[PDB]
């Protein structure tokens, strides 16, 4: 009921201290922010890159491989989002995300942020997307434990799928192919 | 690139019963107290004063000596401020602020978000990243972390924030190192300089 | 006019054999032994010493490093321009302005005429730098006190922090500019007591 | 036939130091709190707490009086056009500045490499500075009862020679220029 898609990372929207795989599909962080040019796609205070592809509408559906990472968050996010200072990444600013924070903390990137009570720590999480109803939701992509949802929210011009990782652990935030 | 902020205070931000010294780096509270023509640009019932210097970019911070004071509130707070009235210092009025209240330390100066501090302070510093939302505040006895508030979006410039309630002891500013600056340096050097 | 608080990283390429550098190359031992190094033109070779990465030619500067427990040290600006290799002395001449600590002592200039009558035991020590003014001061990080200012000098030429780690004891620790709650998450409480690595 | 040409000296505002006050009569000058906002022309001691005069010297022999009274804090004497003014540097014969004060109410020096420790009878509350283009002789004295204060190794002068003033502490006496 959801399209599978094909998500890959754009470097030229990865935050200068975010490494971007051969393949776009993985994602990790450096120790120092790299001397990269500042085009006004690149997110320059949040540690956020996007995919190469957006979304006008439809139902999609991507799956993220968390795996051990203590940290991580992914979501969706409007195409008029404020990429070179900080935002709080809301829904009121265009930012639909769930993640993980200190390795324990579940929380809906809302406001106020909302905490899950993830019973089983997911290794894989699907991003669930609905355009014309306003519909994002999250699930666990192994045992199909229901994450969280967002409330239904009118979307305006185009959706873009953002991938912030604040930590630098071994284990790397990749995508998995469609 | 962090600026080591050279924080002097406003005295016509100042409060009618706060007594800043001739340097403007210090104040306190005494039985006497000014009747100053209580402007727009001004606080008047609530006892708070400003910093002249007002921020609108980078990284800022300055340290401020509280020591054998028993009530304080230092912080930052913007430059479109409401001066008139007593309403709440809390980030929603548009004001940052560390407190010191029964002997306990409250962020965002509310009394149930209280600081587990396992120390006195006797000298705090005031951190503020304005393209970041961050406020926040250290010990600079070991330059520790104590509190940092909720990212706030900065619409206009904002200022140092001063609120003195402890009529015991003055508040002192820590100025900027300034070296020998003003000061004749003999053949061999200035040594333990003190004024 | 305007005081910039120093973000100081050591240039592990001027770090003498003897001297062992942290991840961070915020801190610095002096180990057991050597590295077996390259002894590149950058480096010390006999004077156990490294320099801070980024370099000063104009402006107010000033960063603060931990001494406490190290019983030979010395810090201050160096010339980009100072010779690496010898033996030569840590002294204006030779392009290096120093607050040292030798024998139990604190001494300007790297000098023993110089005592400095300090009797407060030193901890956390500010290294003050104007270019403009040819002023390199020190401070007492406890007390924000003044230490000593050397004599004025026309620097001509880019400036460096620079570190002389003399004692096997403890580390020389150098410490970083606030970031506040830089890559860091603040939770809808705020962030409260943040201890990082 | 004359000795001298009396110098009548007014300051400069243009080249004081932002942190220097000129009076409105352009004879009095006096310290603030903190710099004032003024432009960094070339002419202003953006470094030095110095000021110039008006109008400078290229020739002859010159003299004037300053009124330093209680000053305990003071410096004058000439400087050389090209002197630098934006940065540090030690104002000496060296570097074109021949200066003369007092520092800590009590020790007079001349501002040479090293600078030289004076030894003062009787505080001056007036000097005279004397100068010589042809000598190179820049000279000092005590105006109340004409006795010799200093006088700088003479010098071969090159380009114009202008009246500086330097003072670096807040007090209330002020040092003054007097009327020819
Ligand atoms: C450090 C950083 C973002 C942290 O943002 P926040 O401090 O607002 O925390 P959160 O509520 O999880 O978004 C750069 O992406
Ligand atoms: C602070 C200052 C000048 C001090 O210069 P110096 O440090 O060379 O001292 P002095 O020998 O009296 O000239 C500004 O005029």
Redesign the pocket.
């Known amino acids: 009921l959801f399209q599978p898609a094909d998500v890959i990372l754009d470097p030229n929207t990865a935050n200068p201290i975010l490494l971007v795989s051969d393949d776009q599909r993985s994602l990790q962080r450096a120790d120092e922010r790299q001397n990269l040019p500042d085009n006004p796609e690149r997110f320059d205070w949040h540690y956020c890159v996007l995919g190469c592809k957006s979304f006008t509408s439809g139902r999609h559906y991507w799956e993220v491989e968390v795996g051990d990472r203590k940290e991580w968050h992914i979501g969706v996010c409007q195409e008029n989002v404020e990429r070179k200072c900080w935002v709080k990444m809301t829904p009121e600013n265009g930012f639909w995300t769930v993640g993980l924070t200190d390795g324990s903390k579940y929380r809906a990137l809302s406001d106020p942020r909302t905490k899950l009570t993830v019973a089983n720590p997911p290794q894989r999480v699907g991003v669930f997307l609905d355009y014309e109803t306003g519909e994002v939701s999250f699930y666990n992509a192994m045992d199909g434990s229901h994450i969280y949802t967002f409330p239904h929210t009118f979307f305006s011009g185009p959706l873009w799928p953002v991938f912030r990782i604040l930590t630098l652990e071994p284990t790397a935030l990749t995508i998995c192919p469609a | 690139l962090l600026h080591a902020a050279d924080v002097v205070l406003d005295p016509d931000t100042a409060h009618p019963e706060l007594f800043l010294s001739e340097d403007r780096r210090s104040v306190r509270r005494g039985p006497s107290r000014q009747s100053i023509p209580d402007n727009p640009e001004r606080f008047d019932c609530q006892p708070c004063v400003l910093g002249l210097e007002s921020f609108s970019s980078g990284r800022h911070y300055w340290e401020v000596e509280v020591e054998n004071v028993m009530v304080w509130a230092v912080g930052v707070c913007r430059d479109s401020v409401e001066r008139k009235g007593e309403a709440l210092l809390v980030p929603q009025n548009g004001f940052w602020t560390l407190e010191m209240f029964g002997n306990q330390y409250r962020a965002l100066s509310s009394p149930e978000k209280i600081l587990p501090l396992k120390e006195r302070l006797h000298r705090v510093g005031i951190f503020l990243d304005y393209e970041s939302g961050d406020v926040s505040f250290y010990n600079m006895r070991d330059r520790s972390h104590i509190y940092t508030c909720p990212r706030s979006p900065f619409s206009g410039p904002l200022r140092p924030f001063f609120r003195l309630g402890s009529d015991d002891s003055p508040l002192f500013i820590c100025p900027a190192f300034i070296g020998?600056?003003?000061?004749?340096?003999?053949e061999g050097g200035l040594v333990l300089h003190r004024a």
């Open positions: 020998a600056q003003g000061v004749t340096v003999p």
